[PDB]
Design an enzyme around this catalytic site. Structure first.
Site, PDB file in Angstrom:
ATOM      1  N   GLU A  76      -5.675   6.942  -1.900  1.00 61.05           N
ATOM      2  CA  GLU A  76      -5.767   5.897  -0.879  1.00 61.05           C
ATOM      3  C   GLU A  76      -6.317   4.602  -1.507  1.00 61.05           C
ATOM      4  O   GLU A  76      -5.761   3.549  -1.298  1.00 61.05           O
ATOM      5  CB  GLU A  76      -6.663   6.347   0.274  1.00 61.05           C
ATOM      6  CG  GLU A  76      -5.878   7.101   1.327  1.00 61.05           C
ATOM      7  CD  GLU A  76      -4.788   6.214   1.857  1.00 61.05           C
ATOM      8  OE1 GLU A  76      -5.149   5.111   2.287  1.00 61.05           O
ATOM      9  OE2 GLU A  76      -3.592   6.560   1.796  1.00 61.05           O
ATOM     10  N   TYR A  96      -3.133  14.582  -2.223  1.00 60.88           N
ATOM     11  CA  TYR A  96      -3.654  13.910  -1.061  1.00 60.88           C
ATOM     12  C   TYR A  96      -4.747  14.684  -0.252  1.00 60.88           C
ATOM     13  O   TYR A  96      -4.545  14.972   0.930  1.00 60.88           O
ATOM     14  CB  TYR A  96      -2.483  13.554  -0.152  1.00 60.88           C
ATOM     15  CG  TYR A  96      -2.727  12.327   0.735  1.00 60.88           C
ATOM     16  CD1 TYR A  96      -2.934  11.047   0.150  1.00 60.88           C
ATOM     17  CD2 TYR A  96      -2.731  12.421   2.191  1.00 60.88           C
ATOM     18  CE1 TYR A  96      -3.119   9.899   0.959  1.00 60.88           C
ATOM     19  CE2 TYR A  96      -2.908  11.251   3.014  1.00 60.88           C
ATOM     20  CZ  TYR A  96      -3.096   9.995   2.376  1.00 60.88           C
ATOM     21  OH  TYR A  96      -3.270   8.798   3.081  1.00 60.88           O
ATOM     22  N   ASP A  98      -8.788  14.057   8.430  1.00 61.74           N
ATOM     23  CA  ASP A  98      -8.171  13.021   7.588  1.00 61.74           C
ATOM     24  C   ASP A  98      -8.065  13.571   6.156  1.00 61.74           C
ATOM     25  O   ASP A  98      -8.430  12.925   5.186  1.00 61.74           O
ATOM     26  CB  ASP A  98      -9.046  11.746   7.648  1.00 61.74           C
ATOM     27  CG  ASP A  98      -8.466  10.552   6.848  1.00 61.74           C
ATOM     28  OD1 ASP A  98      -9.326   9.817   6.320  1.00 61.74           O
ATOM     29  OD2 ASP A  98      -7.229  10.296   6.780  1.00 61.74           O
ATOM     30  N   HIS A 148      -9.061   8.331   4.003  1.00 58.17           N
ATOM     31  CA  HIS A 148      -9.069   6.903   4.413  1.00 58.17           C
ATOM     32  C   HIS A 148     -10.512   6.400   4.619  1.00 58.17           C
ATOM     33  O   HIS A 148     -10.713   5.212   4.890  1.00 58.17           O
ATOM     34  CB  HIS A 148      -8.301   6.624   5.718  1.00 58.17           C
ATOM     35  CG  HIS A 148      -6.825   6.869   5.618  1.00 58.17           C
ATOM     36  ND1 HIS A 148      -6.264   8.103   5.889  1.00 58.17           N
ATOM     37  CD2 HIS A 148      -5.806   6.063   5.243  1.00 58.17           C
ATOM     38  CE1 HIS A 148      -4.953   8.041   5.691  1.00 58.17           C
ATOM     39  NE2 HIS A 148      -4.648   6.819   5.285  1.00 58.17           N
ATOM     40  N   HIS A 204       0.868  -1.199   0.000  1.00 59.42           N
ATOM     41  CA  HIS A 204       0.000   0.000   0.000  1.00 59.42           C
ATOM     42  C   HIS A 204       0.918   1.269   0.000  1.00 59.42           C
ATOM     43  O   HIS A 204       0.708   2.226  -0.745  1.00 59.42           O
ATOM     44  CB  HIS A 204      -1.016  -0.034   1.243  1.00 59.42           C
ATOM     45  CG  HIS A 204      -1.720   1.270   1.518  1.00 59.42           C
ATOM     46  ND1 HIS A 204      -3.089   1.423   1.445  1.00 59.42           N
ATOM     47  CD2 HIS A 204      -1.229   2.493   1.888  1.00 59.42           C
ATOM     48  CE1 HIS A 204      -3.407   2.683   1.719  1.00 59.42           C
ATOM     49  NE2 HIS A 204      -2.297   3.358   1.977  1.00 59.42           N
ATOM     50  N   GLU A 205       1.913   1.260   0.876  1.00 60.86           N
ATOM     51  CA  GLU A 205       2.782   2.419   1.054  1.00 60.86           C
ATOM     52  C   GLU A 205       3.695   2.563  -0.170  1.00 60.86           C
ATOM     53  O   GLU A 205       3.927   3.653  -0.647  1.00 60.86           O
ATOM     54  CB  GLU A 205       3.590   2.292   2.374  1.00 60.86           C
ATOM     55  CG  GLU A 205       2.718   2.518   3.663  1.00 60.86           C
ATOM     56  CD  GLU A 205       2.040   3.886   3.592  1.00 60.86           C
ATOM     57  OE1 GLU A 205       2.677   4.903   3.212  1.00 60.86           O
ATOM     58  OE2 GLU A 205       0.870   3.979   3.914  1.00 60.86           O
ATOM     59  N   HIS A 253       1.971   4.371  -2.888  1.00 64.71           N
ATOM     60  CA  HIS A 253       1.989   5.825  -2.852  1.00 64.71           C
ATOM     61  C   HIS A 253       3.163   6.383  -3.710  1.00 64.71           C
ATOM     62  O   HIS A 253       2.974   7.356  -4.408  1.00 64.71           O
ATOM     63  CB  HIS A 253       2.005   6.410  -1.421  1.00 64.71           C
ATOM     64  CG  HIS A 253       0.681   6.330  -0.704  1.00 64.71           C
ATOM     65  ND1 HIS A 253      -0.490   6.871  -1.208  1.00 64.71           N
ATOM     66  CD2 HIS A 253       0.354   5.776   0.493  1.00 64.71           C
ATOM     67  CE1 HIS A 253      -1.467   6.694  -0.341  1.00 64.71           C
ATOM     68  NE2 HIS A 253      -0.987   6.008   0.686  1.00 64.71           N
TER      69      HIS A 253
END
Ligand SMILES: [Ca+2]
Ligand SMILES: [Ca+2]
Ligand SMILES: [Ca+2]
Ligand SMILES: [Ca+2]
Ligand SMILES: [Cl-]
Ligand SMILES: [Cl-]
Ligand SMILES: [Cl-]
Ligand code: NA
Ligand SMILES: [Zn+2]
Ligand SMILES: [Zn+2]
Length: 316
Positions: A166, A157, A226, A231, A142-143, A146
């Site tokens: 996301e 973002y 957020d 998210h 997932h990271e 990015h």
């Protein structure tokens, strides 16, 4: 650093055994030379300065419990690499074989992992909310996704763009989890979230409402926390990607599933060819429809399922 390529063995955060690519120079370092310009894993030693020390082990066996987060950060960075290379012909996160650097044991009781623009960073968790975050292959990928997004569409973002950003990381995190083929599902972070509580996760792509996330555009979060709900609103697009792959009937809309590989082909093409920094949900649907058209033809089942999945989550 310079040395001989070797293969060590160890146990990751969940107690499973795996082999890892190391480099031998007096010590065995977590330096994998078989992938692009290398995958390198560091010990931050509970400090916050980065990257810390290239991880050194005396005997090429990594079975100490202090070693497990390093074993996983290193090994899953290799899986993620192999996924993007073998599946999409992308060489590392920037498409040019950039070194993948990760640090583990970052800070103390830190409940998070992130891509920082140059490297992955993994906290160990506080042992209640999380165990060490590199233990989750979907978290790692997932990271790292990015980074892929940064080098391609550059999605901002915030708000809907940020929620697509996301969702893209949740989608490719999940597809790397399936690619690895050990214990895949459509949940995010199940392996590392809350060790006392079995069967939960940070979010669900198949049923976002299980953790209170929207599964329909009429339920989008419009507050400022957020980063405008990035998210939270990701659930809308997650559920759409889930339906494109597995199918189902969602708010009474039938979607014929086309499977994971075609989900990946379509979303990767959308990401690299059609999304721009400020793409919103409606523009994502257009991007995905055009991608499926490019790949499968405008009259294809694939294009029809993309349309159905977006209709189902109320994105026109
Ligand atoms: Ca050892
Ligand atoms: Ca899983
Ligand atoms: Ca998962
Ligand atoms: Ca749990
Ligand atoms: Cl493991
Ligand atoms: Cl994140
Ligand atoms: Cl359409
Ligand atoms: Na939630
Ligand atoms: Zn993310
Ligand atoms: Zn439903």
């Amino acid at each position: 650093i310079t040395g001989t390529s070797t293969v060590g063995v160890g146990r990751g955060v969940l107690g499973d055994q795996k082999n890892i690519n190391t480099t031998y120079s007096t010590y065995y370092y977590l330096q994998d030379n078989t992938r692009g310009d290398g995958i390198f894993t560091y010990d931050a030693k509970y400090r916050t300065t980065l990257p810390g020390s290239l991880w050194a082990d005396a005997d090429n066996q990594f079975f100490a419990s202090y070693d497990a987060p390093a074993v996983d950060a290193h090994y899953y960075a290799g899986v993620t690499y192999d996924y993007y290379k073998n599946v999409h012909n992308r060489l590392s996160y920037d498409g040019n074989n950039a070194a993948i650097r990760s640090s583990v044991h970052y800070s103390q009781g830190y409940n998070n992992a992130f891509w920082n623009g140059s490297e992955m960073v993994y906290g160990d968790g506080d042992g209640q909310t999380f165990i060490p975050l590199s233990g989750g292959i979907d978290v790692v990928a997932h990271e790292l996704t990015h980074a892929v997004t940064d080098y391609t569409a550059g999605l901002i973002y915030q708000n809907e763009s940020g929620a697509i950003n996301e969702a893209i990381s949740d989608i490719f995190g999940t597809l790397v989890e399936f690619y690895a083929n050990k214990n895949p599902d459509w949940e995010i972070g199940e392996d590392v979230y809350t060790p006392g509580i079995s069967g939960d996760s940070l979010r669900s792509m198949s049923d976002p409402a299980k953790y209170g996330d929207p599964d329909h555009y009429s339920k989008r979060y419009t507050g400022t926390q957020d980063n405008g709900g990035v998210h939270i609103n990701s659930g809308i697009i997650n559920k759409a990607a889930y339906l494109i792959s597995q199918g189902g009937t969602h708010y009474g809309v039938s979607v014929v599933g086309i499977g994971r590989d075609k989900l990946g082909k379509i979303f990767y093409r959308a990401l690299t060819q059609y999304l721009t920094p400020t793409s919103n949900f409606s523009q994502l649907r257009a991007a995905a429809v055009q991608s499926a058209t490019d790949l499968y033809g405008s009259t294809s089942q694939e294009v029809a399922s993309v349309k159905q999945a977006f209709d189902a989550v109320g994105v026109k």
